[PDB]
């Protein structure tokens, strides 16, 4: 019942093809359909119907830059809407404040130990000898992130 196939017909390769079918000129000649399409596109361009790609690029280069070139003017009064309250002014965080604002080490330790986001101040005022000695402030990013969170997470 189950036997391997036999190559009686496939044993000998076909030296010659099956049908002559003399080759047409189009095989040895550039495509005529492509020429017809090119002529159609030329006619469309001449009739002012298709913008050439170079013209499109030139027009787009001028465009895409006319943004923000029109006056927009020339809202929370609803009872169920409230405006976003702005942060209060500074709290005496001067780089060169009076010595009174320089918190004592014992109270500075308490400020440092206390939790975050429930603190009276986010900084420790310091008495810097010179303006050039003022260091950087890497905590500004965290404060801005917290402000952004509060902006859209405020159950008014």
């Amino acid at each position: 019942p189950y036997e391997p196939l036999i190559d009686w017909f496939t044993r000998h390769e076909e030296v010659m093809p099956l049908t002559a079918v003399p080759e047409p000129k189009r095989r040895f000649v550039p495509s005529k359909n492509e020429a017809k399409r090119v002529m159609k596109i030329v006619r469309a361009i001449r009739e002012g119907r298709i913008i050439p790609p170079k013209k499109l690029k030139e027009m787009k280069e001028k465009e895409k830059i006319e943004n923000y070139q029109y006056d927009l003017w020339g809202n929370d009064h609803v009872m169920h809407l409230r405006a976003p309250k702005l942060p209060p002014p500074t709290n005496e965080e001067s780089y060169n404040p009076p010595e009174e604002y320089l918190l004592s080490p014992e109270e500075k330790e308490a400020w440092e130990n206390t939790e975050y986001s429930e603190r009276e101040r986010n900084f420790i005022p310091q008495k810097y000898s010179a303006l050039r000695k003022v260091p950087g402030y890497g905590e500004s990013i965290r404060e801005r992130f917290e402000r952004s969170l509060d902006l859209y997470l405020a159950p008014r």
Binding site: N67, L72, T90, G136, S148, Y152, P155
Partner: protein
């Protein structure tokens, strides 16, 4: 109210996209059903859907192994615009001027932020350009009134049309970016404030009879690049 998950399901939008839309529209919570229903008509939702479709199509093209198709798709794509969303939230220019405090704070903070993986250098460059334009306009109008050097930075106050808006600028020292802050949320605010500041700067320049956007002095840009390098011409 309707739970956040319920609102997201009603909007059938991704959580990140939903947060972006909420930030753009200023919605707050557990949200009112009417507000969420109204938000569904915003074109930004359609733009986000188009972006998702484009993303899936581009992934398909790239996986298939046709870089040209993906490049063509990317070139033809266009980004959404916040121009109209600004008007509804700020019907009047004075409201935009009043709210410009947080926009200026964020733009100045991001201008000095070093380039990182989370935020491309293009955004930082745009923020720096916006800050330079604002500083040049303020200096020309001489609207600076209050200066307070502090640990956080220098608290500036520009009396733009007498609104005495207070803004803060951090120092130029390098900043160690913490991992706690999520830049994804901050990027939406950055984009919204960049668009708002662009519109406000154009309006101010038109009011003051100044051509916008002014070019930048190239020779100064190779030496003292910054506020001084941004030359402004009245006409």
């Amino acid at each position: 109210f309707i739970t956040r998950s319920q609102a997201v399901r009603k909007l059938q939008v991704s959580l990140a996209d939903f947060r972006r839309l909420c930030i753009f529209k200023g919605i707050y919570p557990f949200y009112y059903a009417k507000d969420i229903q109204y938000l569904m008509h915003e074109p930004v939702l359609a733009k986000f859907r188009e972006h998702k479709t484009f993303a899936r199509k581009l992934t398909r093209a790239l996986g298939r192994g046709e870089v040209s198709s993906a490049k063509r798709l990317e070139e033809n794509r266009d980004s959404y615009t916040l121009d109209h969303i600004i008007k509804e939230r700020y019907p009047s220019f004075p409201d935009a001027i009043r709210d410009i405090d947080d926009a200026l704070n964020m733009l100045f903070l991001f201008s000095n932020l070093p380039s990182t993986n989370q935020v491309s250098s293009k955004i930082i460059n745009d923020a720096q350009k916006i800050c330079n334009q604002w500083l040049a306009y303020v200096a020309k109008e001489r609207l600076v009134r209050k200066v307070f050097v502090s640990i956080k930075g220098v608290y500036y106050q520009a009396n733009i049309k007498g609104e005495e808006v207070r803004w803060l600028v951090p120092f130029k020292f390098p900043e160690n970016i913490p991992s706690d802050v999520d830049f994804r949320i901050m990027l939406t605010f950055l984009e919204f404030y960049s668009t708002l500041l662009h519109f406000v700067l154009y309006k101010l320049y038109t009011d003051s009879g100044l051509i916008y956007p002014p070019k930048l002095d190239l020779k100064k840009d190779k030496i003292i690049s910054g506020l001084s390098s941004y030359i402004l011409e009245s006409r």
